[PDB]
């Protein structure tokens with residue numbers, strides 16, 4: 001039995017007194033509110049909020065039975081007796097407390113509306129709509145998963161509803177979520193301990209909702225462009241020779257390569273007993289400074305794996321103990337416990353001493369030539385209950401360990417290299433870990449079709465709640481005795497159209513594309529080159545992710561917000577605005593049914609035009625591609641393929657525009673900068689190319705422009721080939737900035753024509769110079 005007693009308005013926050021205690025309500029933006037119960041007491045700080053201290057002017061009004069605390073779009077309605085808070089966008093009911101905060105265990109209970117669909121929980125393989133499911137909030141490995149999981153590496157204490165709110169349980173501790181499983185109409189959140197707070201964020205659309213959420217939880221800083229390149233990875237290169245031979249293999253096989261990744265053999269010859277050395281094993285890596293320098297000469301970066309644990313058998317045990325860097329038992333000694341790798345402790349990233357000790361190690365190695373960082377096992381993979389961290393016990397801090405690990409490493413990399421963008425790849429974090437540049441992958445996936453088939457679900461679930469760069473170990477990671485060639489190819493094809501191109505697997509079967517048979521390479525080589533040719537498209541989606549939270553992969557359901565049933569789809573997704581991709585996730589599939597949104601669509605590979613008023617499209621399949629449709633009105637930008645993003649140039653642009661009269665107005669954007677400067681967006685050191693198409697019955701008009709202050713090495717003038725797909729055969733006239741130019745109707749591929757119509761392909765090609773001044777191209781019948 002809970003009831004209202006008193007309220008004060010302090011700072012700009014609303015403090016309520018019930019018979020149970022104090023509740024602090026602070027709007028963190030016009031559409032987002034932090035609700036802290038037990039506000040009187042001392043508890044862990046927020047982990048989810050980018051600006052935990054902030055609060056903004058809200059309106060407070062009072063009636064007999066209710067309080068009303070309102071920002072821009074979001075209103076908290078506080079019923080007095082019984083005490084229950086509910087949330088409104090306009091006068092639309094988002095979410096109502098049931099019992100709300102219970103208190104002894106932390107417990108929160110809310111009503112679910114009938115028909116409400118609930119995405120969330122981070123990594124699970126349960127179906128996109130998680131309503132009717134119950135699962136723990138306890139990051140934990142799921143080695144060799146395939147087609148089912150209620151508990152994996154990276155849970156999120158958050159949901160997204162079909163009513164277009166996000167709800168965050170801002171709690172770091174061992175806990176659970178029950179999404180109307182136990183009780184049909186109840187969402188319950190629970191933890192053993194930790195902060196008793198939740199955050200509600202509203203939006204008018206899924207994009208707005210995501211913009212609002214990243215506003216208050218954190219925006220991912222634009223990664224270095226090289227993170228969009230080809231990674232060489234396995235578990236693991238055993239030697240400097242083997243690592244050099246793999247970089248060579250990429251060069252001799254003519255596959256693009258930006259980064260080679262070194263797994264745990266860089267610090268010792270065995271899987272067990274060396275973890276915590278954090279230093280080169282010189283018997284097998286005798287000249288690593290030279291190695292890394294030699295790779296940099298070929299435009300190739302080195303990334304090293306690190307882990308939370310220091311083994312008692314490692315060379316750094318005594319020193320970490322001496323420095324007070326490890327977590328302790330309640331008795332005050334270094335806590336040691338038996339991992340797979342052996343007996344060892346865990347570095348306490350929540351302490352001053354642990355942070356400084358660990359940071360200093362990353363500094364030294366980074367100075368030696370390491371460009372980027374991989375942090376494995378941050379669940380933490382093993383985390384005994386009575387381990388003590390500076391700010392709480394293992395069970396209290398568990399779900400925020402990797403988060404703070406990232407924060408630590410990020411801050412360190414920014415301080416060491418303020419003119420570079422950190423690369424931090426990790427397996428486990430918390431809500432908001434994207435603000436530390438976290439790039440997550442979906443752990444030790446099995447080498448099965450089921451492993452592949454689950455990757456879209458996982459990617460979208462993570463993407464929707466802040467992690468644009470979620471990806472998988474391409475080809476699969478765990479077990480297997482012999483390569484499943486077809487599955488491998490399918491996985492590396494999907495790879496091209498997902499955030500991070502990183503094949504990686506246990507080294508009894510080759511993970512890297514350069515080690516595959518002739519047929520496999522002949523299929524993947526042009527697709528990996530394609531990934532580089534598409535860097536303008538991807539890098540611009542990345543820019544929009546830094547700007548607004550918009551994920552690179554978007555779910556089908558974005559296409560129609562009034563059709564909740566689309567939420568179930570996890571087999572087709574949008575890569576950027578323009579490409580609807582359907583990965584093939586079983587052997588020998590001969591055709592697919594694609595649930596294309598109403599409109600006009602083109603086969604990306606074959607240029608076939610399709611119109612649909614709702615009905616799905618059947619496309620055939622081949623082994624050389626996977627089905628990808630382009631939306632009418634798309635501008636697809638390309639540059640020439642390079643071996644490494646270090647050699648990237650946009651001097652030459654090739655842009656393909658998919659025309660259809662069904663789209664009378666279309667826009668595209670290309671975001672160019674130096675690909676490395678972390679301040680480029682803030683300081684406007686960029687070149688933002690825009691393209692606007694206007695398509696009427698008798699005319700097709702393109703307006704081209706550039707904004708921003710540019711950057712060092714930016715081309716003043718780009719040679720631009722614009723290819724118009726599905727172009728009318730009736731255009732008599734082109735003018736470029738008012739100057740008339742004849743359109744040739746033959747030999748388009750075989751003269752240096754400025755404008756040429758290919759009648760057999762229905763493509764009109766325009767070649768021109770795109771300088772800093774605005775440009776209009778007008779086609780007319």
Ligand SMILES: OC[C@H]1C[C@@H]2N[C@@H]2[C@@H](O)[C@@H]1O
Nearest residue numbers: 235263264305376443444
């Ligand atoms: O470091 C060895 C191995 C085990 C952990 N699953 C991660 C994986 O990426 C890594 O390759």
Ligand SMILES: O=C([O-])C(=O)[O-]
Nearest residue numbers: 661696697727728729
């Ligand atoms: O306008 C068009 O595209 C046509 O008529 O071909």
